[PDB]
Each structure stands twice: as structure tokens, then as C-alpha cells.
Scaffold this active site. Structure first.
Site, PDB file in Angstrom:
ATOM      1  N   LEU B   8      28.630 -19.712 -21.039  1.00 13.79           N
ATOM      2  CA  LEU B   8      27.365 -19.063 -21.398  1.00 13.79           C
ATOM      3  C   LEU B   8      27.030 -19.382 -22.848  1.00 13.79           C
ATOM      4  O   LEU B   8      27.804 -19.059 -23.749  1.00 13.79           O
ATOM      5  CB  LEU B   8      27.438 -17.546 -21.193  1.00 13.79           C
ATOM      6  CG  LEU B   8      27.332 -17.065 -19.743  1.00 13.79           C
ATOM      7  CD1 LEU B   8      28.564 -17.449 -18.944  1.00 13.79           C
ATOM      8  CD2 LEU B   8      27.114 -15.562 -19.690  1.00 13.79           C
ATOM      9  N   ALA B  10      23.290 -19.506 -23.955  1.00 13.77           N
ATOM     10  CA  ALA B  10      21.820 -19.455 -23.983  1.00 13.77           C
ATOM     11  C   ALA B  10      21.233 -18.631 -25.139  1.00 13.77           C
ATOM     12  O   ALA B  10      20.008 -18.571 -25.298  1.00 13.77           O
ATOM     13  CB  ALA B  10      21.296 -18.920 -22.653  1.00 13.77           C
ATOM     14  N   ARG B  15      20.892 -12.551 -35.431  1.00 12.72           N
ATOM     15  CA  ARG B  15      21.553 -12.038 -36.637  1.00 12.72           C
ATOM     16  C   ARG B  15      22.271 -13.112 -37.475  1.00 12.72           C
ATOM     17  O   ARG B  15      22.884 -12.791 -38.496  1.00 12.72           O
ATOM     18  CB  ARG B  15      22.530 -10.913 -36.274  1.00 12.72           C
ATOM     19  CG  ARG B  15      21.896  -9.704 -35.585  1.00 12.72           C
ATOM     20  CD  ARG B  15      20.648  -9.213 -36.304  1.00 12.72           C
ATOM     21  NE  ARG B  15      20.391  -7.790 -36.057  1.00 12.72           N
ATOM     22  CZ  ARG B  15      20.639  -6.798 -36.917  1.00 12.72           C
ATOM     23  NH1 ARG B  15      21.155  -7.035 -38.123  1.00 12.72           N
ATOM     24  NH2 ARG B  15      20.358  -5.546 -36.567  1.00 12.72           N
ATOM     25  N   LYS B  22      22.627 -19.859 -31.332  1.00 13.96           N
ATOM     26  CA  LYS B  22      23.850 -19.146 -31.701  1.00 13.96           C
ATOM     27  C   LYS B  22      25.136 -19.979 -31.659  1.00 13.96           C
ATOM     28  O   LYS B  22      25.950 -19.914 -32.585  1.00 13.96           O
ATOM     29  CB  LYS B  22      24.021 -17.927 -30.796  1.00 13.96           C
ATOM     30  CG  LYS B  22      25.053 -16.925 -31.281  1.00 13.96           C
ATOM     31  CD  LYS B  22      25.234 -15.805 -30.271  1.00 13.96           C
ATOM     32  CE  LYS B  22      26.026 -14.669 -30.874  1.00 13.96           C
ATOM     33  NZ  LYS B  22      26.476 -13.670 -29.866  1.00 13.96           N
ATOM     34  N   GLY B  78      20.728 -11.534 -17.924  1.00 10.20           N
ATOM     35  CA  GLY B  78      22.088 -10.994 -17.895  1.00 10.20           C
ATOM     36  C   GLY B  78      23.146 -12.031 -17.581  1.00 10.20           C
ATOM     37  O   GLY B  78      22.842 -13.121 -17.093  1.00 10.20           O
ATOM     38  N   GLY B 101      30.247 -19.104 -24.998  1.00  7.48           N
ATOM     39  CA  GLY B 101      30.093 -20.137 -26.015  1.00  7.48           C
ATOM     40  C   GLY B 101      30.224 -19.646 -27.446  1.00  7.48           C
ATOM     41  O   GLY B 101      30.398 -20.455 -28.363  1.00  7.48           O
ATOM     42  N   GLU B 151      32.536   2.442 -18.435  1.00  7.57           N
ATOM     43  CA  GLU B 151      31.843   2.245 -19.705  1.00  7.57           C
ATOM     44  C   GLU B 151      31.963   3.480 -20.605  1.00  7.57           C
ATOM     45  O   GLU B 151      32.236   4.588 -20.132  1.00  7.57           O
ATOM     46  CB  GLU B 151      30.367   1.902 -19.466  1.00  7.57           C
ATOM     47  CG  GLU B 151      30.120   0.664 -18.591  1.00  7.57           C
ATOM     48  CD  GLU B 151      30.647  -0.638 -19.192  1.00  7.57           C
ATOM     49  OE1 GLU B 151      30.759  -0.735 -20.435  1.00  7.57           O
ATOM     50  OE2 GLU B 151      30.938  -1.577 -18.415  1.00  7.57           O
ATOM     51  N   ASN B 224      28.730 -12.735 -33.779  1.00  6.75           N
ATOM     52  CA  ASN B 224      27.299 -12.415 -33.655  1.00  6.75           C
ATOM     53  C   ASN B 224      26.521 -12.636 -34.954  1.00  6.75           C
ATOM     54  O   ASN B 224      25.288 -12.663 -34.961  1.00  6.75           O
ATOM     55  CB  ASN B 224      27.130 -10.963 -33.198  1.00  6.75           C
ATOM     56  CG  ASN B 224      27.686 -10.720 -31.803  1.00  6.75           C
ATOM     57  OD1 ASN B 224      27.589 -11.575 -30.925  1.00  6.75           O
ATOM     58  ND2 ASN B 224      28.266  -9.546 -31.594  1.00  6.75           N
ATOM     59  N   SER B 402      38.411 -55.810 -69.788  1.00 10.83           N
ATOM     60  CA  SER B 402      37.688 -54.544 -69.771  1.00 10.83           C
ATOM     61  C   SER B 402      36.187 -54.711 -70.005  1.00 10.83           C
ATOM     62  O   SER B 402      35.754 -55.596 -70.745  1.00 10.83           O
ATOM     63  CB  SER B 402      38.277 -53.587 -70.816  1.00 10.83           C
ATOM     64  OG  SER B 402      39.616 -53.257 -70.489  1.00 10.83           O
TER      65      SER B 402
HETATM   66  O1  1SF Z   1      21.339 -13.718 -19.808  1.00 11.70           O
HETATM   67  C1  1SF Z   1      22.297 -14.052 -20.490  1.00 11.70           C
HETATM   68  C2  1SF Z   1      23.234 -13.030 -21.057  1.00 11.70           C
HETATM   69  C3  1SF Z   1      23.671 -13.470 -22.430  1.00 11.70           C
HETATM   70  N1  1SF Z   1      24.243 -14.790 -22.353  1.00 11.70           N
HETATM   71  C4  1SF Z   1      25.265 -15.064 -23.286  1.00 11.70           C
HETATM   72  C5  1SF Z   1      26.457 -14.376 -23.195  1.00 11.70           C
HETATM   73  C6  1SF Z   1      27.478 -14.606 -24.093  1.00 11.70           C
HETATM   74  C7  1SF Z   1      27.316 -15.541 -25.091  1.00 11.70           C
HETATM   75  C8  1SF Z   1      26.120 -16.219 -25.166  1.00 11.70           C
HETATM   76  N2  1SF Z   1      25.976 -17.189 -26.219  1.00 11.70           N
HETATM   77  O2  1SF Z   1      27.026 -17.569 -26.744  1.00 11.70           O
HETATM   78  O3  1SF Z   1      24.839 -17.566 -26.522  1.00 11.70           O
HETATM   79  C9  1SF Z   1      25.084 -15.999 -24.284  1.00 11.70           C
HETATM   80  C10 1SF Z   1      23.580 -15.801 -21.675  1.00 11.70           C
HETATM   81  O4  1SF Z   1      23.807 -16.994 -21.829  1.00 11.70           O
HETATM   82  N3  1SF Z   1      22.614 -15.363 -20.789  1.00 11.70           N
END
Ligand code: 1SF
Ligand code: 1SF
Ligand code: 1SF
Ligand code: MG
Ligand code: MG
Lengths: 450, 450, 450
Positions: B8, B10, B15, B22, B78, B101, B151, B224, B402
Site C-alpha cells: 500500500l 497511495a 504532514r 508519502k 480504505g 509502503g 478497538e 507519517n 610547481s
Molecule cells: O485507501 C487506502 C488506505 C490508505 N492506504 C495506505 C495505507 C498505508 C500506507 C500507505 N502509504 O504508505 O501511502 C497508504 C492506501 O494505500 N489506500
């Protein structure tokens, strides 16, 4: 009562993955074993018996000048066996302190306290409190004295929670060592003769064993690999830095300061981050050292500022001098008071007189420069091909124009003036002006290829 | 059983306050996502499905050569929705590991253990123990297996004290992912489809969910913002340094050492404080690196000493060479064995032969220098105006006086001698001596304005 | 309600072992007392009463421009006595905050909260929770308010376990200060008039004393020696670095970053390890700073990369410029957009026009260089002997050949070309080519002494 020391240093140090034996790896620029030898000497040791084995020839070459008795242990049959190799040289009524060559941080103050606590015909044992004592021999006290050292595998639930453990560092008289060492056996899982067993043998003879706690855990720590060695290095540097800070040296960040030798200092000395001090260094009052400097075996007078990224070795700098940034002083550089050395300047085996300036892109080697000289940017002292580094002599109040080559052997007398771009091969007389006659071709209307 | 990965990536990373998405921010010189891709490859992943979204064009340019399936997620609805974009490409009977990621420190060893623990038709969930688990989903075990992830806002007093929490990293077979992902809803405060809900769905189907704890908390930490990223950087560097120390590299201070790539080393290598190693670097036996050096993509032979504040890139240095301090090796610098490069010297795209020395205030570019040459202080290789960087060829056993300029294209043959302050434009023959005839004006009794 | 401040700064600071008085030692390049003065000003203090004593003349010289009322305390008879020296200047209905000159980390936010909590005709006392409160006065609360400050030697077993202690920082109205200060006695072991006694006197008058806890222990810490000062320095730098990281500045290692002044930044700025930022520094978007750089009072445009070990002061650098490594910008260096400055180059009080390059072993001083110039390696601007630093003027599109000396005052017009090894003393015209006619002696068959 007299004192002698035994230092165990026979180890291969396999987990260092090195061609060196274990105790020759350095802390603060000096072999671990040298730290212990010096500490032994500080205590007033009459003899220092160095038990050595692996890397014998390297030990001999690296520690050639050390005042120690070289005791070769051909087989590492245990710490008791190691100490017994030196035992024939123990005086009956001198104290003997046993130290380990891979535990360099042990302090004189702790050892003086250990020796003081030694009861007559008894033993003083150095102990330490660990939060996780798992694996180490637990100290069992019965009315003030050590009655047993109980090993991990033998200890009961209650004893396992004892935090005080054995370090192996101990003091006893020579006669007692000779007596008890001959009674140590090797009936154990490892088949080794352990010095630890002296505590049992002492109790057998109704002789008192007194525990003396070390104040700092790290002080008794040994290094078995380079990760552990790095931890000892940082603890040691932090402690050196802290002492200097309490003495009034402004160290901007003590976590980014390294002393590898001895520092003598005046008052109001300021040392910026990432400075390395090596060998014997002396700084006067109000010396300022900028970031990234390296000082090795140097004397720096009062009110000198050394600007960032300057490297100085085997050099002397007079009061109110200004050095850096990006200055290089090589061995034999002697800068008088109120001198100036600037960026991308290299000074080797030369004397530079009061008030003189050498501020850019210059090499001065094997030279004498007088007072109030102006050495221009790009000036280079050089030799003929096949020469033997001959000398350049520059008098007082001389102006040397930028990008001039001074070809040794040559003399430039007081008050001489040398124009820019000159090649000086012949001696220049007092108040002589030497300027280069250039021939130039001028082509008008030359359009550049653009 | 075969394996594929989903990563993941995206996220906008708001921040970070950056124009980059990211996961492209670097740890140890390489994007966070590249770390995860490499780890996925180390595991033996057949396919790597990269879920991307924000900064799509930048992702494509920065990761152009990566062997991944590019799966665009137009709306971040999500983690379950993200994974379902790649689901059509899952093989029914391959395992699928889900990774994030922005969590680059996750190790192969931990993931191998996670995969091994996966029961047939079930899930393996990576968990971690936190001292303050506040905010994270608590793992509820009933006879060895995970029955619920509760949770923060739902947990009772007893459950709130559970320290084991969900990381979101999990493994299951492709068929099971396809099945359960289609059953994930978004009925929650956030209106998102959570991958977390697979644990409930697995239990619904009477399929086993097994918990596997991560050994290191930091291994599963995401970044983050840049403060958190800096924390991951330091943890990572500390770990790299520790490994090298245990391998026998003497790193004087591992808190002041940075590796941004790969290091190959021999024995008895010594690295002083504030050294940065970048790209692919190879050091032979007994290499010593002084303080402040930067090595990027270099090969250094046995017994080389690099003195302080030297910067080397895309260069090769033969055995027993001496470099620094204040030396600059630019790309294509090839130094033979037993060569010498000194302070304020710049070498670019040149070869320098065995035994040759270039020790002060010199630029050598686009040149070939032979063996046992003496390149004097102040020597500069240069071109005519409008040239295309032509070459200077210097043979063996040449002396260059030199402050001489060598004007390319030019050749200086074996055994030639060039005097100081010379401008060389024409080729110099074998054993030819070239010295400059200077014309000078001498004015006696010139009193300086002082 | 109006506000004024009193700052206690009369101390000798004996354990600093310095010729300076205590509060003049610096944190982040600025005296401890200056930090407190600035914070007092940030709060909107109308008057700042500086209580001084030891090192009076040094205080006056070092803080000459500070907007404070200089209140001399000839005898250090206690904190209450100190404050009473300023009391005649208190307005009856303004608030007065008492601060200590050796506690520089106290924040505006904490002090605003202290002032807000002050009840009418009462006192607001700043307190702090210590894990080991041994030695400090324990805060005794009875229904929300401070009824007593119980000292170590007086406290009972129960009170000894109170972790909240008195900092001495407090706020009350001017009338109340005048009233209670006149009632403070010195009947104690030290014979001093303690400000602490105001809490007892307030309770005597049935006036409310409210406790306000400080969030950070270190915020209220004073420095009595340089070890403690170094601890404040590191806490302060860590906090500055953390703020910048959260603002989106990529600081590779915040433990190896120093800000000594103010930093203004754009987005995607990258700062490598061991960088020092001094005075007022401004960085545009995407500025990259390599390891070991020092920037003091500089403005750096968008997309500039500064490579390692560059030192810049009182300089301006235009967008897309490339500087370093080993570059020196001295005061008055003004680099236009897309310029290039390379290793072992020094630029002093000069302007360099768009696209121009000065890449090796060069000194440019007191010069104007135009656009798209090529300044060759080894070029030096210099003066005649006894000159007053005259100017070199170089136009646009000029080529200056390597190792050329430019002898000011001199002008080189647009499009001129100067050959290598030239000495320029006369003005060069537009599109004029100037090349040096060299005379050389060639000796064939010269066998070198080897
Ligand atoms: O809809 C979603 C939920 C969040 N997510 C996501 C989740 C964890 C890490 C990262 N990232 O490193 O960018 C993205 C996604 O890639 N898609
Ligand atoms: O037989 C033995 C036991 C081990 N030992 C030994 C003990 C402690 C430290 C070192 N050392 O620093 O190398 C060696 C010895 O010197 N001999
Ligand atoms: O009589 C006194 C008590 C001590 N005091 C004082 C109190 C706190 C801090 C400092 N200082 O930073 O120098 C001085 C004073 O200024 N005067
Ligand atoms: Mg020159
Ligand atoms: Mg010249």
C-alpha cells in the site's frame, strides 16, 4: 605494604575478527592493555606481570617500551593457571592485584578502595550490582563477608534474585596467592582452573573475604567484540568530556568530542562540535576551536582562534594567532604570535614570524619566514628535481606577490618586494624590488566561439 | 507454496509538507517504498502489486525500473479497498503478504516467520507489544488463536490493559483474500473498508487466525511526518552499524556513521567519526578512513589510508595508496597502487600510475599520468577556449615543476622534466628538459610603503 | 492588565571557572540572560528590570542594546532582596513576573498560563514534578491552593514523597510585591531574604496562592556549571530540530544539527548531518545542504545545492546555483542565479553574474564578475604593495585562462579572452584576446637523477 599487579592478556579475541590479539585494540587511541598498565602504575605497582599468549610477537612490538614482566602462557588453561605463571615472582608480603587486559575502564580510585578493604591474610573481591545478573556468579554474604560465589546453574530461586555478582578482580598477599593457586583444580564442565575458586579456598582456611562494590557498572566491563568496544569508547569519552566541562572547558556538545591523549587547558576555552584532540595538546586561555578541527600534539597560545576544518599536527601556535578555516599545519609548523593562516594553506616544517600572513592557496615548506611578511595567494615554495628538500629563507617585512614560486635554496632579505607571477631562483637583497617582465600578444576583435 | 506481495503506497503524506507523495521520502538514501519492494523480493515474491494513487507521475518516474504491477487506486476508500484493486491478479493457491509502503524497516526474517505460521485456509497476523497501546486494536486470543481485534473505543477495562496490538500486516492465500475482501463493509465512523475486518470474517468461516509477534517494535513503525522518519533513519543506521561492528569493522562511533547503500569489507578496517558511505562501496583489508570522509561508489584496495575530510565518488584506489586530507576524487578517478594524493587536490576522470604523487593545490582532469611521476604543487591541466575537454597524456618518470599549466591536447613522454612556472602547449619528448626563461626587472633600494 | 518582568542576573557563576559572570554564557549562540529578556519581551512586558551585580562592566558591554532597566545589586543578600531593588519601579496595578537569568529555556506559553492563573491580589507559583525531589521545597496543597512550601530538612516522611516542588518563578501584582517584600526576613541558616517567603506572607494575608505546573522539567532548569549548560544546549537544539522536522524540513539527523539564530525555510529542504546554521538564515524551496556545512547570515534561493564542507557568511546565493564542496563564501559574496563555485575556491566581497563559473583553486576578492564568465582554475585577484584593496571589474562572457593573476585596479570588458598563465595589469578591451608569449629553453637528452 608494597604492591604488584598481574594483568591477564593472553586472549585471541576471536570475535574481533582481527589479526591482532584481543587486548591490543584501542580505546581513546591507546591499546586496552595499555590503559590497565597505566592504571597499575598509577596505583604504585612495583612490578607489573603481563600474562600474554596469542599474538605474542605483535604484543612485543606494540608494547615494547612498557615496564612489565613478560610472562608467556603457552596454554590458556584458565585464569588461575594464568596467574600462577607469575606467582613465582610474587613477594610473600606484598599485595597483588589481579586485573584483566580487556577491561580498560577500571579506575585507580576503585582499586585503591579494594586494596584498603583487604583484611590481613584474606582477600578483597571487587563486585558489581547488575539489574539482570543472569549468567554471573552471585555473591553470598554471611555477616559482612563473602562465604560463596554461587554460579547461575547451581543457584536456588532466592539466590537467582541476588543482583551483586563477581567481577574476578581481587587483591591478596603474595604468600596467600602461592598457597591457594597450588590448590585450584579443574573439576568442572569447562576443565579450567578458575581464579574464582580462591574464595572457597580462603573460606576453607578460615581467612576473610571482603566484598567491595564498584560504583560504575561500565568501569568493570570487558570488550569481547567491537560493538562492546565501541560502547566502552563512548562511556570513556563521555566521562572525559564531563570532567573537562566541570573544569570550565566549554564543550558545545560532549557527545561530539573526542580526546585521545591528554589535554592541558586554560580558562574560557571554547570547543565547537566534532573536534578531535590527539596526543599531547595544550591550549592557553580563551582559545576557540571551530567545528571539525583535528589537533594532534600541538601547543596553542592564549587568545588563538582556530576556524572550522583545520588540521594541525606537531605544531606550535603563538598567542593571538588566527588559523583557518581549511588550514593544514604539518609537523614542524611554528607560528609566532599574531600570525594569520587562511583557507587552503599548507605549512610544513617552517617558522613564520610575528604578524606575518599566509591567507590563501599556498604551500610553505622547509622555510623560515620573518616578521610582518605578506605571503600572497598562490605562493609556492619548491625544489629542483633531485634536490633534498632545501630551505627558503625569507627575512622581515617582505612582500611576496601572488602566484610566485620560491625555488629553494634561496634567500630573500629584509624589506624585499616581489611582484606577482615571479619565479625566484636567485637570492633577493635588502630592499630589492623584483618584478617580472611579461611579453603579451594582444589581438583585437577576437570573437569568442559562443 | 508460491508467494506474492501487495504494498500500500497511495498516500498523500500531508504532514510531510512536501510535493512528493508519502512513500518516496528516503531512508538511508532510498525511498521508503523501495525498501519494502526489496524485502518483498528477498522473500521470493513472484509478483509485487504496488497500490499507488497520490503523486502518481512522480511514483512512476522515481520507481521506473522496479519490477512491480502498477495498480492505481483512484479513491482511498480504505486498506481493504486498496488490496481489492490487486485481488483479481492473486493466484488462488499462492500466499499473499500485505505490506505498507510507509513502514520500511520490516525484516525478511520476521515475514518468513509470519508466512510459516499461516494455517491452511487461515490468516497469519503480525502483532506487536506496546507499553502504551492506547489507540491501537487489542489482540484477543482464545486458545492460541486471534478471535477478535478490539478497538480502543470498544474495549473494556480489562482489554485496555492488553499490550499486544494489531499491525495490519498479514498473510493469507489468494482465494481467501478474494472471498473475504468482497464481504468487507464500511459501516463505521470513518466510512472506510478496513483490511482489519478479515479477522472477523475468517472467524465467521471457522478459519484459524494465528498471531505472530514482531521482535522489534521499530520494525513495524510507519512514518507519517519527517520527525518520525528521522527516528526510523537513526534506528536503521544503528542497526547497520551494529552488524558491521559484529562483523569486525572498527566503527569508532556508530552514532556518527551513515551507510546509504552497500558496504563490502575486509578485515581490520577502521572508520573514524562522521563518515558517510554511499552507493556501492568496497574496502579491502586494513583500510583506514579518517574523520569527515564521504565515499560514494568507490573501490578501495588493501592498506589504503584516507585522511580526514576527503570526498571520493565513482573512483578506484589501488593498494597502499595514501589519500587526503582535503582530497577530492571526482568520477573516473583511477589511482594505482602506492600513489599519493594530498591536500587541496582535485582529480577528475584521470588515471594516475603506480608510485606517482600529486600532493598540493592541483587540478588534474581528463588526463593519463604514468608511473613514478612527481606532479608539483599548483599544477593545473586546462583547455583552450571553446575546446571539448581534451586529454593530457603524461608518461612514466616525469617531473612537472610547481605552478605549471598543462594545456590539452598535449603529450609529455617518459622521463621528461618540466621546470616551475611553465606553460606547456607543445608535446614534450622523451628525456626532454623544458624550463621557462624569465625576464625580471631588479630595482635596488626600493623602500616599501611601511 | 499590564505586565513587567524582573530578571535575576547578579551571580558570579563560580563553578563556570570563567572571567564572565554567570548569565553571559551562551545557549545557541546567545547569552542565557538574552533568552530570558526576549521571552519577557514576547510576553508583552512593559518594563524589564535586570538585577545585575558581578561582572557589571561585562554585562553592560555585552547587553548594551537591550531595552532593560539596569538595577545594580551591590550585595547578594537573597532573591527577595534582589527583587526589592526593582520594587520602587513596579506599578501598583501591573502584574510582575519574576524570572531567573540562568534558566533560559522557560517558554512564553508556560508563562502566559502562569499569569492567567494568578488570582486577584494573590500569587501564581510555577511548580514542577521531579522523580527525585530530594533537596527542593515541597508544594503543600490544601483545597486547590498552595498553603506552604516545606523545605527538605523540615518535611515529614509523608511530605518527603511529594514530587511537586517550587521553582521560584512567580507572578503577583506590583502593590502586593511592595507590601510583602518589606516583610521578608532573613532568620534562617543562610541569613538570606528568600522570595519563597512570599507564599507564607500571602497566606498570612488570606490571599490565594495558585500552583501552575510546568510541562517540561528541563524548561525550568538552571545551569550552575558548563556540564549543566551543555545539557540545556542539547535539549534546546533537539527541540528546535523537532519543530523544523514537523514543519517539513528534512533533517537527516536532528542530534547532529545546530541552529544558533533564526531559520526561514521553504518546502522540501534537505539538511545532511553536522550542519551549523548561525545568525539569520533564509533557505528557499528544495535547498539541499550537504554534510559539514556552516551557514551564517545568508540568503539561499530556490533549488540551490550546497555540497559538503562549504562555509558561507554574510552572503547571497541566487536560485539554481551550485556551491561546494570545499567552497568559502566570505562577507559580501553575491552569487547570481545558475552560478557555480567549486572546491578550494574563496569568494570575498564580490558579485558574480548569472551562469558564471569559478570551479577550482581560485581567490576572487573585491571584484565584479559579469554573466556567463569562465574563471579558470588557479586564477587570483591581487593588489600592488601598499594598495587599499582596489577593485577588479570583469564584464560579461569573459574567458580567464587558468593560473592568471588579475592585478587591481583593472577592467576586463565584455567578450574578452585571457590565455593561461597571464599577468593582467592593464585594462582589457571588448573582444580583446590577451595571450602570454613564453620563452622556453629545451634541452634534449636530459637524463633525470633516478
Ligand atoms: O485507501 C487506502 C488506505 C490508505 N492506504 C495506505 C495505507 C498505508 C500506507 C500507505 N502509504 O504508505 O501511502 C497508504 C492506501 O494505500 N489506500
Ligand atoms: O587461561 C587464561 C584464561 C583467559 N585469560 C584472560 C582472561 C581475561 C582477559 C584476557 N584477555 O584480555 O585476553 C585473557 C588468560 O589470559 N588466560
Ligand atoms: O541575592 C541574590 C540571590 C541570587 N540571585 C540570583 C538568583 C538566580 C539566578 C541568578 N543568576 O542567574 O545570576 C542570580 C541574585 O541575583 N541575587
Ligand atoms: Mg598558481
Ligand atoms: Mg603561475
Amino acid at each position: 605494604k608494597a604492591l604488584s599487579a598481574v594483568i591477564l592478556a593472553a586472549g585471541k579475541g576471536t570475535r574481533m575478527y582481527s589479526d591482532l590479539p584481543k587486548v591490543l585494540h584501542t580505546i581513546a587511541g591507546k591499546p586496552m592493555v595499555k590503559h590497565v598498565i597505566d592504571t597499575a602504575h598509577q596505583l604504585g605497582s612495583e612490578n607489573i606481570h603481563l600474562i600474554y599468549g596469542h599474538g605474542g610477537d605483535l604484543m612485543r612490538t606494540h608494547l615494547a617500551n612498557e615496564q612489565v614482566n613478560w610472562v608467556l602462557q603457552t596454554e590458556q588453561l584458565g585464569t588461575a593457571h594464568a596467574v600462577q605463571q607469575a606467582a613465582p615472582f610474587f613477594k610473600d608480603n606484598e599485595n597483588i592485584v589481579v586485573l584483566y587486559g580487556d577491561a580498560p575502564l577500571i579506575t585507580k580510585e576503585t582499586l585503591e578502595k579494594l586494596i584498603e578493604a583487604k583484611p590481613e591474610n584474606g582477600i578483597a573481591l571487587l563486585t558489581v550490582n547488575l539489574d539482570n545478573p543472569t549468567g554471573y556468579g552471585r555473591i553470598i554474604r554471611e555477616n559482612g563477608n563473602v562465604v560463596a560465589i554461587v554460579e547461575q546453574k547451581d543457584a536456588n530461586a532466592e539466590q537467582l534474585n541476588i543482583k551483586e555478582v563477581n567481577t574476578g578482580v581481587m587483591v591478596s598477599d603474595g604468600a596467600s596467592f602461592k598457597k591457594w593457586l597450588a590448590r585450584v583444580g579443574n573439576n568442572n564442565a569447562q576443565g579450567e582452573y578458575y581464579l574464582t575458586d580462591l574464595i572457597a579456598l580462603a573460606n576453607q582456611d578460615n581467612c576473610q573475604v571482603v566484598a567491595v562494590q564498584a560504583t560504575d557498572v561500565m568501569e568493570v566491563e570487558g570488550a569481547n567484540n567491537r560493538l562492546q568496544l565501541a560502547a566502552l569508547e563512548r562511556y570513556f569519552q563521555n566521562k572525559q568530556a564531563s570532567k573537562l566541562l566541570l573544569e570550565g572547558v566549554m564543550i558545545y556538545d560532549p557527545a561530539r568530542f573526542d580526546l585521545r591523549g591528554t589535554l592541558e587547558h586554560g580558562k574560557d576555552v571554547e570547543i565547537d562540535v566534532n573536534v578531535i584532540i590527539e596526543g599531547n595538546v595544550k591550549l592557553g586561555d580563551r582559545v576557540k576551536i571551530g567545528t571539525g578541527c583535528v589537533l594532534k600534539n600541538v601547543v596553542i597560545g592564549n587568545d588563538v582562534e582556530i576556524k572550522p576544518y583545520s588540521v594541525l599536527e606537531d605544531s606550535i601556535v603563538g598567542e593571538k594567532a588566527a588559523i583557518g578555516p581549511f588550514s593544514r599545519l604539518r609537523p614542524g609548523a611554528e607560528l609566532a604570535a599574531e600570525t594569520h593562516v587562511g583557507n587552503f594553506v599548507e605549512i610544513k616544517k617552517s617558522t613564520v614570524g610575528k604578524g606575518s600572513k599566509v591567507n590563501h592557496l599556498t604551500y610553505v615548506g622547509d622555510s623560515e619566514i620573518g616578521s610582518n611578511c605578506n605571503i600572497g595567494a598562490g605562493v609556492i615554495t619548491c625544489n629542483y628535481d633531485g634536490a633534498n628538500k632545501f630551505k627558503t629563507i625569507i627575512g622581515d617585512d617582505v612582500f611576496v606577490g601572488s602566484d610566485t614560486q620560491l625555488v629553494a635554496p634561496v634567500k630573500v632579505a629584509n624589506g624585499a618586494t616581489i611582484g606577482a607571477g615571479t619565479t625566484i631562483t636567485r637570492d633577493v637583497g635588502e630592499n630589492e624590488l623584483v618584478i617580472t617582465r611579461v611579453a603579451q600578444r594582444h589581438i583585437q576583435g577576437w570573437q569568442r566561439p559562443i
